[model samples]
Target: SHQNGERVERYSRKVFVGGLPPDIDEDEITASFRRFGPLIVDWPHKAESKSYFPPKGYAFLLFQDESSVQALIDACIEEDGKLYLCVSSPTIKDKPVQIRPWNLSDSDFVMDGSQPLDPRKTIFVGGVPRPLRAVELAMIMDRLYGGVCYAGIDTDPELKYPKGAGRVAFSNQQSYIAAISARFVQLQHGEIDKRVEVKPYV
Candidate 1:
C-alpha cells in the first residue's frame, strides 16, 4: 500500500484518491465515514464548484491530523464499504499538487534544489496521436490519476498541428505519478495513439 512507502508523507498528512463518482453527495460522505474518528470538519472549496451544480461529488474531509486521518482511511476501504472507495494509504507524487517549503526536508527522496516550492509543474509530452484533442488528454489523466487534468492540444494563436502532447498536473504530486505509471493508460506511452512522457516544466 502507499502508506508504507514514505515516512515523510506518512507524517506530513493528507491523501490521494480516485474512483469517486463525480455526483457523490457530501452528507452521504460524512455519515458513511464518521466511524473512523471525530470530524474536525468536512467542507468543499470553490474551485470549479461554481453554479453549485450538485457540488462536484468530491471534497476534502479534515480530521484531527496525521493519525486520525490515517486511521479513518484504513477503515474506509473496498472490503468495509466499497462504495466510499476512499484510500487510507496514499502514494508519493514526484510533483506534489501544492507544497509548503518548510516540509521539503521531510520527503523520502533527495531533490536537486532546496525543498520544493511552487513548481512550474509543466510536462512536455511527445508522441500524441495525430488527431488527438485536448479533451482526450484531460480525460485520460483523470481516469488514471484521479484528478481533473487539463491541456492545450493546439497552439492558441492559430489552431495549428496538434502539438505533440500536454501537461498533466495533479491536485498533488502523488496522484500525478499514479497517472504516469498507471497500467490503465487508454493509449500506451510511446506507442501509437498513446505514447507520452511526464516531467517537470521544460
Candidate 2:
C-alpha cells in the first residue's frame, strides 16, 4: 500500500527464479537479466560450506525498478538455449503476486477452463513439481484416457508458485475411475521430478 498520491502499485520489486542450474553463479544471473535493467541477483551460498549449491536451485532477484520485473520475466526464459526454470513472485506481505508462464508469448496457447466441471469426475493430484505447466498436466491425462475437461495447478495465494498440487477434471466417471486406478503419474520438464499422487477430488 502507498500513501495518498504516492505510487500505490508498490510491490517487492523482487522475483523468485527457481529451478536454476546448480552451477549458475550471481554474475551469470546478473548478466542475463541486464537486458531488461540492472538487477541485484543473488544465490546466497553459505561461506561456511564447501558446496556451492543454492537452496532448491532457486535465486532471488531485486530489480532497480518495478517495470523491469515484467521485462525480466518476459526475456529470461532459458539461460543459454537449453534450460528452463520456474520464475515467480517472492511473496511479500500485502503485495500482489506476479506469477506467469515462461511461454506467455505463444499466441496459440490458452488455458482451458471453458468445459463444464463434474466434481465426481475430478481427480486430485498432489506433489506436482513447481515448474510443471497446467497444459502439460492436462495433456498427460488426455493422453492416458480421453475426455479430459480441465486441469489446473494450485498456487499459494501470495507467492502464486505451484503449491505442488493440481486438479484434473475428466468428461465422465469412467475416465475418472481409470485415472484413480492408475494411482500415479511421472512427469519431467526441465529438472522437475515428482511422482504425482492421485485421489478422487471429492
lDDT of each: 0.41, 0.55
| Residue range 1-202, candidate 2, lDDT tens digits | 9543323213335456554544566665565444446666666664557655464556766666655544445444544323333433222222222333322222112235555556666677666565555766666677776566666777665534456678776645577678777776666744554566778776
TM-score of each: 0.31, 0.52
Pairs in clash, predicted candidate 2: none
Best by TM-score: 2
Error of 1 at 11 (Å): 49
In angstroms, the error of model 1 at 105 is 41
